[PDB]
Amino acid sequence: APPAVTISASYPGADAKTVQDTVTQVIEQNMNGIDNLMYMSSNSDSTGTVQITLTFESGTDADIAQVQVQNKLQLAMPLLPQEVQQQGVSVEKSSSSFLMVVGVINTDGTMTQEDISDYVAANMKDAISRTSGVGDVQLFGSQYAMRIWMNPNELNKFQLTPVDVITAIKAQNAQVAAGQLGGTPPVKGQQLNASIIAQTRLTSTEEFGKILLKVNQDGSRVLLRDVAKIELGGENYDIIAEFNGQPASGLGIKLATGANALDTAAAIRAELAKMEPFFPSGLKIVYPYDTQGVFMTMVQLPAGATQERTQKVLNEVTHYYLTKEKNNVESVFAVNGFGFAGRGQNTGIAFVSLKDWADRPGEENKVEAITMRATRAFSQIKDAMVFAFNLTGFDFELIDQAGLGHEKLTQARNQLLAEAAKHPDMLTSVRPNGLEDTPQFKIDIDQEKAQALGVSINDINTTLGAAWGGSYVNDFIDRGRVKKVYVMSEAKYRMLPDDIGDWYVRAADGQMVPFSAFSSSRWEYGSPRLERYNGLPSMEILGQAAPGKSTGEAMELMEQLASKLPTGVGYDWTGMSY
């Protein structure tokens, strides 16, 4: 297979364009001078995530490819936003499919899904990630951070903002290098040498809750807990898993390019065996997907679908396997928020493990027939693509060659898809691989009104972003382990458009100014996932030859339709069609 190296980065609270124009384009522009690169593709998403895939000529040494990529990325790192740099950028040389899933459940229902995920993140994932052959490890859930859930009513009552909160956290959750008594070079006759210990990271919600934000003129104290709820909770809330319908987390493990499948899996089990004796009570490992006695089901809903609606679809999938197929299926491990493609609120995946072969006699109880029957049962689910598969027609990129921009490229894409649909004798299921534009809330900050009021634009933008998007402030120590601190609005003050107006910013003169005084807003459409191909804006189109036609005939026709598109729109073949 051509080896591929993946760069991943994140920007908390960023929309797709923001990610693309501050991160993705910057990396791409700097991926020069790397040997044997066949092509590069990227997605920039409204989850705040970018993935850049660099695919190398067959025969390329994946180690050299990875090192060359990492080194260019290193020279580009100072060009990226500080918020992106501080999340950690990763570079992996991995297969894109899973080798295995390590599930973790709590048999005594002592621990919620969130607890279990933190336990895995904080106690298991690093040692697995260091096991030789392990290319990529996905946590099905999130590590805890310290979560400061801000209340805008209480902030405004005390004439405070998220900026004051972030400032206080950085000042009061600090790890200070303070020197030594009797330090070198010392005076003659010194008797005592001892470290000076000053501020140290906080370790608990109790300690965060008593951060001192201010002292009122009257002498009363405003503590962080007087304007926020303080709790441990995920760095993010996007991925939730279940094992046979019960709360779970786990690790999805991808094989390092060129490593040995069987050796790596055994190294993994051996590492798990070291951890088990120290689990808290109730906690237990399950094995829901070991790579013909397994398969996957993909769930892909339209952009716009929420966590609740993806979950309803996954509940249908899971139910089918635990009822209609309960004689063949041993388990289902289902993940809401991550799928084939990676991360989104509109996607899911179910890993299905079958009973022993010898106990599924009959060709109707073998994987091929089970997957076919499942796809057929799920083919009627509304506004979802749901199918079961183990783990070919064409792979086309439409390309913006002339700075046309997203809206025009979408119109060209639609023109091509309409033309393709008039040739059903030659092309079947010609479709975009990506996502459709969805409504977004465009808010305009009035620079004039802000200046007239003495309200700083940086205080406005921090207030907006930190409250509605979240902001990674600094690190703390949870039960001995370095983890993140995040500030964000408590959920109920960031749900609806009118909530924008309840957030106040402090002017230079000390007055509190509501957001409504200096902003206006409207609905518009934009992209939840912007694609690029060899550094240019792109839209991936999949399809296949119609029955009784060669792939090459299907491709020749696509090329002909492509030659009639608006000026500045090109194309290229990738993946299986390269």
């Binding site: 008797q191 005592l192 109790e206 008593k210 104290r221 807990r225």
Partner: protein, 156 residues
């Protein structure tokens, strides 16, 4: 005093009950002090070695020895939640209202760590509930600040 002194400080530190009895019998200075002014009784109180505490007190250890920052063995026992050591020290005459150089008392320290059984024994032995440290703060302020309603109960 002695090289036995240094040995007694090390033995009390590391909890070595027997070696403490021996060094005692050989005339080690019971009130030998290290460079930060900690005596064997400080060291046994901090590290929770109850039996070493008792043995040193029977041998005339100064119950109110103060380190170079004004802290007494009771401050250390109270701060580190060693209840039985706190009782023994108070029975041997530990100053329940001793203040360190910052005006901090054993009650302030037990209160800040939420060591409630210790708070109770301190108050039983006459701890001044209104004693202020250098910043004006009482054990009650400490309870309000830390959000410990159970401790706020006890101290009214």
């Amino acid at each position: 005093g002695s090289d036995l002194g240094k040995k007694l400080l090390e033995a009390a530190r590391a909890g070595r009950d027997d070696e403490v009895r021996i060094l005692m019998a050989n005339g080690a200075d019971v009130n030998a002090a290290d460079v930060v002014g900690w005596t064997p009784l400080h060291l046994a109180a901090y590290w929770g070695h109850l039996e070493i505490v008792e043995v040193l007190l029977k041998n005339g250890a100064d119950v109110n020895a103060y380190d170079t920052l004004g802290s007494t063995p009771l401050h250390l026992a109270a701060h580190f939640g060693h209840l039985e050591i706190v009782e023994v020290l108070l029975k041997n005459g530990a100053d329940v209202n001793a203040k360190d150089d910052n005006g901090i008392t054993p009650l302030h320290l037990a209160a800040n760590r939420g060591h409630l059984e210790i708070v109770e024994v301190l108050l039983k032995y006459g701890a001044d509930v209104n004693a202020q440290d250098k910043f004006g703060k009482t054990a009650f302020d400490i309870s309000i600040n830390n959000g410990n309603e159970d401790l706020a109960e006890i101290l009214q």
